[PDB]
Design a protein around this ligand. Structure first.
Ligand SMILES: CC[C@H](/C=C(/C)[C@@H]1C[C@@H](OC)C[C@H](O)C(C)(C)[C@@H](O)CCC[C@@H](OC)[C@H](O)C(=O)O1)CO
Ligand SMILES: Nc1nc2c(ncn2[C@@H]2O[C@H](COP(=O)(O)OP(=O)(O)OP(=O)(O)O)[C@@H](O)[C@H]2O)c(=O)[nH]1
Ligand SMILES: Nc1ncnc2c1ncn2[C@@H]1O[C@H](COP(=O)(O)OP(=O)(O)CP(=O)(O)O)[C@@H](O)[C@H]1O
Ligand SMILES: Nc1nc2c(ncn2[C@@H]2O[C@H](COP(=O)(O)OP(=O)(O)O)[C@@H](O)[C@H]2O)c(=O)[nH]1
Ligand SMILES: [Ca+2]
Ligand SMILES: [Ca+2]
Ligand SMILES: [Ca+2]
Ligand SMILES: [Mg+2]
Ligand SMILES: [Mg+2]
Lengths: 437, 427, 54, 343
């Protein structure tokens, strides 16, 4: 058994992390107090769920997790919330004042003063790992902490844990729920600095989650709670292969092997189905062919883009529930003749398929109906570069007039880091064009 | 976390006192410092503006400054006068004679150290101080001259904290002395350099609103101050109640100020309601939105239709449909997209608080960083120049040791500010 | 279209469907950047304090 | 009211639409880089489709189907018809074509060409490209002409037996106008044009291009007595149908128009799953210009499809009005039909 440490940075990372660990506990039968009746080995063991949970002599199942934020109010809710008994106080790290939506403040000014405390707390977790795989890092692009402190942390983790894989779950900014005008700046700055330190990154555009919540869950104005419960379902289907017995994506390195042939092009598009309103009185259970076909609908993607106008490099189908390989193959055959699914010439046209028989768990009283089968498709398509183009364009509009740049320089960042980061993004866009055009 | 509030001079203390009356009521604090509210949303961020004293007593983190005792005697005698910390009253006897030089250089310089003693004591007992807010006028002597002296001294001791002001701009329509353009130009010179956010509250706009909109034949300062305290309550709502957006002074400044000198905001409020006047009619979300963007509802006497918005913050208060608020806010931007600069994408941010202000079921507060604010500084500059080209009334200032060169520099800096707004109005 | 690498367990199964075959900065360098940014903040503050002293 | 931007000035069809838009009093034109538009008259090349449909509170409509260049580029169309199941290589309304690079089909073309020399059948081909035409009877000079240039060329079967209008013994090509809206309804304009030739068709020398190429530019300049039978070398549908009834005892609907509607519906329903904007975050529509050939057996051939087409002079008012009525007002409603719905 090989352990995984989850790191949750800033408000978005912390609140999504809470959603995830609530869901993990429901999926594994762990009570809020940490007890797990079905675990017959007290205070030890190396089962698959032990990759995410350590155990105390008292039978408490403790998340291998660290929460970090530069102000205390979000993590305070964890300290006094339903799952407060779950976490050790050392795992919950708060500063005094936040990065004020300023990458330079989170990275240089405040990050310098807190980075060593965070690494010390991570080392305490690592010291209890017989074979650490690496890290799963949750954070927003747009926040000052999520962007700036995360990029510093990723750099230092490459130093302290050079042989360890690092995966990201990154919240891409959407004006409908965004809090800062400078989020395009923070997103480009943190992508440039993190790019060589992240092996695989799952971007989630808040706009897509927002619209899925409105359209499929009939929520008039979705809140972060609505968004985070949907996001945790997708995160859970992505990380289930690390937490349950299986043969596909059983370790962090396998995400890179199966999804990222080119190191810079390490942003797989996630698509999830079905998303069904729990308020619906009568539900019609979608078939394997129907949820598999929904994976090629832009309306179900975590980032709105058009895969018909890019090329695939890799494609993984992750089913949960009542699914057998016979029906998946009959579905894939049908879809191939009716959909625009073009791979790059130097890659096989194929799918790696994983099935977990346990259906998706839902939070009691949440917005998501229980379904008998669900699927998350992870696909590395060049079409996700549309998201970079949108982001780089908003950057260009503001940076041409140097709007807000003085906030960053006032924190000791050089103005040249803007153009250096933007040039890296220009080369990233060109890389996607070379692969897919 | 904590904010330290300073109010200086007659105008600053009269609007400051009404500000504390209003928000004390919203947070359920009675005139004796006891909490008597029914909602926990009232206490969740109470420490932003109030210290906790034993006996469950909440005391405003407020410093009251003046160079004459009169207005602050009235504050002690007023409705909520017993709520202020008696050690936080700092006052002289001589007055400032509506003279910026007396406030800034002679009379105010004698009193400034003991104000900083009280500021230091309040800051030292702060868990994590955000910064400072100052209320004052620019047209007199204490609030304008000593207020800006205080700002400079506070920046020197707390260079990494945010400095915010509510600055009342003088107008010939509501004027006490002819030297107001001098005091205001000297003050703007200071504000451009040493504040992070300044709310420009124009007595010209306040009068016009009382007269034309509220149908008050003879507006008094009390009527003017009713609009200001309601606006101050609105613009601080995001700091005082739980919320996601512009929740502290620094995040607000980062969202609102694209260039450090252009930090002068036009505030507005809807619905406009006068003193003691109860209108019981429900105001729909479309009506709130249209009225808060309406030129007639702005409290800096400039026409936003003549300029472009760099940034906008809107705060809705009361129980209402958040879907409707989003729809109406997008409706205004999509239908009138020319009034918002295209090189700052998504520059309008909306916040919503459940707790409405007293007397209203719903309201909306507007904070705009519009290039049309140049019209306010143009107006002051013309009134300054009409007198200064004849050196009229200057002896009041040279008698305090000032030189004419300091006037020329302050005028030059304000005209530069005007030019910088016009630059981004055409960009 | 062939199915390869079919693995089965009591919790699920996995396999692969093929349709068509094919045709870092060091610790010292990080601290250097952090300290250089700190020195730039210190210089800018010193310039302010010098201005206020004037 | 509604808003739109203009990133393509040279569109004579969308200038009249933009003028008609403003003439309604309910439309307003924005600057070029203002993202708060309901409608984009986008650039023909490098259109940033990736930035459309991401503006909260705006239904966004662009005048182009992303991915419609497959039908509108010559080599792309030859590859589409051959490789698509719905169209097949055995497509009987499309002349035998071969993509030839200076994915190539040099050997496959030499095989069918030499076949035509063995049986002594008509063996005249034509080289053309969407970038620029050389009609020849010998293959060694068509391959040499593709290599002097440096772009992809197609070699298509030149219809040696066209239908000839009398008097004049002259060649014509038919242009149809098809509007496909956001719901992918296929609307064929009731008015087409015949871009005729001014000088008699001459099968002896393919050297003089004027009698073989029926383009309006090649006739406006290279032909003397240009426009002596009809004004501007353009015969509209009421006159051509009268000639078909007089000269051939048939109608334009029966002998020609049923085939034209068939080809329009074949090509468009073919790419429909690859370009449809149903359930996409931004909608699309596009006006297309089909170019057809009619041979002496009254059989219709498809020549090419133009995604950025110009309109005949006397039909600018009616068609642009239909563009505003069916494509734009159906998405943005204002406060007889000139189209034939192909379904
Ligand atoms: C959008 C930014 C704003 C600029 C404007 C031009 C705004 C835009 C809208 O009001 C939200 C216009 C409003 O819907 C109607 C049509 C009912 C208008 O008849 C009300 C009074 C006239 C108006 O002036 C022309 C007003 O006083 C104002 O300001 O109109 C400046 O804040
Ligand atoms: N999906 C989702 N997005 C969130 C959540 N919280 C914040 N965001 C998004 O994250 C971005 C703001 O960044 P935050 O994570 O709040 O900021 P931060 O990391 O705490 O950094 P600072 O507050 O600047 O120190 C915006 O785009 C928000 O829409 C959340 O709980 N769920
Ligand atoms: N296979 C073929 N048989 C007979 N004539 C042909 C032919 N291929 C092309 N032509 C003639 O050549 C002319 C131009 O051909 P084509 O339509 O490929 O050029 P183009 O793309 O410049 C036209 P447009 O400007 O209308 O889009 C046509 O008007 C037609 O008469
Ligand atoms: N809105 C408002 N303006 C005031 C009030 N009192 C004075 N003013 C204005 O303030 C300016 C005079 O400054 P004042 O504060 O009285 O002088 P100070 O005591 O030296 O600071 C003039 O522009 C007056 O119009 C008040 O209570 N409300
Ligand atoms: Ca165990
Ligand atoms: Ca590494
Ligand atoms: Ca004295
Ligand atoms: Mg935060
Ligand atoms: Mg006075």
């Amino acid at each position: 058994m090989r352990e995984c440490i989850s790191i949750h940075v800033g408000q978005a990372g912390v609140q999504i992390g809470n959603a995830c660990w609530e869901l993990y506990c429901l999926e594994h039968g762990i009570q809020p107090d940490g007890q797990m009746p079905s675990d017959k080995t007290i205070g030890g063991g190396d089962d698959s769920f032990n990759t995410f949970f350590s155990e105390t002599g008292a039978g408490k199942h403790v998340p291998r997790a660290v929460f970090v934020d530069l102000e205390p109010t979000v993590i305070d809710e964890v300290r006094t919330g339903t799952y407060r008994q779950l976490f050790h106080p050392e795992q919950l790290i708060t500063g005094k004042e936040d990065a004020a939506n300023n990458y330079a403040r989170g990275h240089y000014t405040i990050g310098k003063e807190i980075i060593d405390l965070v690494l010390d707390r991570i080392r305490k977790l690592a010291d209890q790992c017989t074979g650490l795989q690496g890290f799963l890092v949750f954070h927003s692009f747009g926040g000052g902490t999520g962007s700036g402190f995360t990029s510093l942390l990723m750099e230092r983790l490459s130093v302290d844990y050079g042989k360890k894989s690092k995966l990201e779950f990154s919240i891409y900014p959407a004006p409908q729920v965004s809090t800062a005008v400078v989020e395009p700046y923070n997103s480009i700055l943190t992508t440039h600095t993190t790019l060589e330190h992240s092996d695989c990154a799952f971007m989630v555009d808040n706009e897509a989650i927002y619209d899925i919540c409105r359209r499929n869950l009939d929520i008039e104005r979705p809140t972060y709670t609505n968004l985070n419960r949907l996001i945790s379902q997708i995160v859970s289907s992505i990380t289930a292969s690390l937490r349950f017995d299986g043969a596909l994506n059983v370790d962090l390195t396998e995400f890179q092997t199966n999804l990222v042939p080119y190191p810079r092009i390490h942003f797989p598009l996630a698509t999830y189905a079905p998303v069904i309103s729990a308020e619906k009185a009568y539900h019609e259970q979608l078939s394997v062919a129907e949820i598999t076909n929904a994976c090629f609908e832009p309306a179900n993607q975590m980032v709105k883009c058009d895969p018909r106008h890019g090329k695939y490099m890799a494609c993984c189908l992750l089913y949960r529930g009542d699914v057998v390989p016979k029906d998946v193959n009959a579905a894939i055959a049908t879809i191939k003749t009716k959909r625009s699914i073009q791979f790059v010439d130097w890659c096989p046209t194929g799918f790696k398929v994983g099935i977990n028989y346990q259906p998706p768990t839902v939070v009691p009283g949440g917005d998501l109906a229980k379904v008998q089968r669900a699927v998350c498709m992870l696909s590395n398509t060049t079409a996700i570069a549309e998201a970079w183009a949108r982001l780089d364009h908003k950057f260009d509009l503001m940076y041409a007039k140097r709007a807000f740049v003085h906030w960053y320089v006032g924190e000791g960042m050089e103005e040249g880091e803007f153009s250096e980061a933007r040039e890296d993004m220009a080369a990233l866009e060109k890389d996607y064009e070379e692969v897919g055009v | 976390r904590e904010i330290v509030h300073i109010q200086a001079g007659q105008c600053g203390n009269q609007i400051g006192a009404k500000f504390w009356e209003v928000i004390s009521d919203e947070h359920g604090i009675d005139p004796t410092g006891s909490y008597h509210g029914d909602s926990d949303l009232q206490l969740e961020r109470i420490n932003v503006y109030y210290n906790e004293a034993t006996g469950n007593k909440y005391v405003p983190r407020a410093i009251l400054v003046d160079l004459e005792p009169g207005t602050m005697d009235s504050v002690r005698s007023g409705p909520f006068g017993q709520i202020f910390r008696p050690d936080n009253f700092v006052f002289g006897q001589s007055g400032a004679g509506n003279n910026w030089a007396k406030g800034h250089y002679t009379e105010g310089a004698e009193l400034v150290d003991s104000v900083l003693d009280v500021v230091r004591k309040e800051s030292e007992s702060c868990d994590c101080l955000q910064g400072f807010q100052l209320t004052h006028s620019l047209g007199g002597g204490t609030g304008s001259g000593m207020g800006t002296l205080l700002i400079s001294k506070i920046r020197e001791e707390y260079p990494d904290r945010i400095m915010n002001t509510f600055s009342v701009m003088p107008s010939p329509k509501v004027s006490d002395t002819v030297v107001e353009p001098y005091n205001a130009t000297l003050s703007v010179h200071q504000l451009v350099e040493n504040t992070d956010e300044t709310y420009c509250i124009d007595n010209e706009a306040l009068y016009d609103i009382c007269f034309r909109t509220l149908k008050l034949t003879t507006p008094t300062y009390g009527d003017l101050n009713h609009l200001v305290s309601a606006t101050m309550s609105g613009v601080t709502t995001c700091l005082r109640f739980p919320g996601q957006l512009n929740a502290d002074l620094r995040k607000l400044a980062v969202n609102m100020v694209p260039f450090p000198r252009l930090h002068f905001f036009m505030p507005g409020f809807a619905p406009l309601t006068s003193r003691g006047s109860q209108q019981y009619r429900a105001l729909t979300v479309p009506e709130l939105t249209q009225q808060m963007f309406d030129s007639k509802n702005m409290m800096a006497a400039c026409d936003p239709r003549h300029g472009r918005y760099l940034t906008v913050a809107a705060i809705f208060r009361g129980r209402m449909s958040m879907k409707e608020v989003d729809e109406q806010m997008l409706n205004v931007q999509n239908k009138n997209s020319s009034y918002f600069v295209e090189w700052i994408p998504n520059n309008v941010k909306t916040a919503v608080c459940d707790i409405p202000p007293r007397g209203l079921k719903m309201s909306a507060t507007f904070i705009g960083n519009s290039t049309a604010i140049q019209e306010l500084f143009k107006r002051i500059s013309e009134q300054f120049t009409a007198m200064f080209r004849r050196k009229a009334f200057l002896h009041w200032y040279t008698g305090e040791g000032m030189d004419e060169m300091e006037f020329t520099e302050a005028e030059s800096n304000m005209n530069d500010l005007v030019s910088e707004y016009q630059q981004y109005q055409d960009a | 279209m062939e199915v390869i690498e079919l693995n089965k367990c009591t919790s699920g199964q996995s396999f692969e469907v093929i349709l068509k075959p094919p045709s870092d900065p060091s610790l010292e360098e990080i601290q250097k950047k952090l300290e250089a940014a700190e020195e730039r903040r210190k210089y800018q503050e010193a310039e302010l304090l010098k201005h206020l002293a004037e | 009211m509604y808003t739109f931007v203009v990133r393509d000035e040279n569109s004579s069809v969308y200038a009249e639409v933009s003028r008609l838009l403003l003439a309604t009093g309910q439309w307003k034109r924005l600057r070029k880089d203002n993202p708060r538009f309901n409608l984009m008259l986008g650039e023909r090349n490098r259109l940033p489709f990736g930035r459309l449909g991401h503006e909260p509170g705006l239904v966004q409509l662009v005048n182009y189907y992303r991915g419609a260049d497959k039908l509108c580029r010559k080599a792309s169309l030859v590859k589409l018809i051959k490789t698509s199941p719905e169209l097949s290589e055995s497509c009987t309304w499309f002349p035998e074509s071969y993509v030839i690079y200076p994915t190539d089909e040099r050997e496959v073309f030499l095989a069918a060409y030499n076949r035509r020399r063995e049986g002594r059948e008509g063996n005249v081909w034509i080289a053309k490209s969407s970038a620029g035409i050389l009609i020849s009877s010998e293959a060694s000079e068509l391959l040499d002409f593709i290599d002097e240039q440096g772009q992809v060329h197609v070699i298509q079967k030149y219809l040696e037996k066209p239908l000839l209008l009398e008097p004049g013994h002259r060649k014509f090509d038919i242009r149809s106008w098809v509007l496909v809206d956001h719901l992918y309804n296929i609307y064929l304009y009731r008015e087409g044009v015949l871009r005729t030739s001014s000088e008699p068709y001459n099968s002896a020398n393919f050297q003089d291009k004027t009698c073989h190429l029926t383009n309006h530019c090649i006739q406006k300049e290279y032909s003397k007595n240009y426009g002596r039978y009809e004004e501007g070398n353009e015969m509209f549908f009421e006159e051509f149908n009268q000639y078909l009834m007089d000269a051939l005892n048939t109608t334009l609907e029966n002998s020609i128009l049923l085939q034209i509607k068939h080809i329009i519906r074949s090509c468009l329903m073919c790419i429909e799953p690859a370009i449809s904007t149903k359930h996409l975050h931004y909608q699309s529509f596009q006006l297309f210009g089909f170019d057809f050939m009619v041979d002496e057996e009254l059989k219709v051939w498809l020549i090419e499809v133009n995604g950025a087409p110009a309109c005949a002079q006397k039909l600018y008012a009616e068609l642009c009005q239909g563009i505003v009525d069916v494509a734009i007002s159906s998405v943005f409603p204002l406060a007889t039909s000139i189209f034939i719905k192909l379904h």
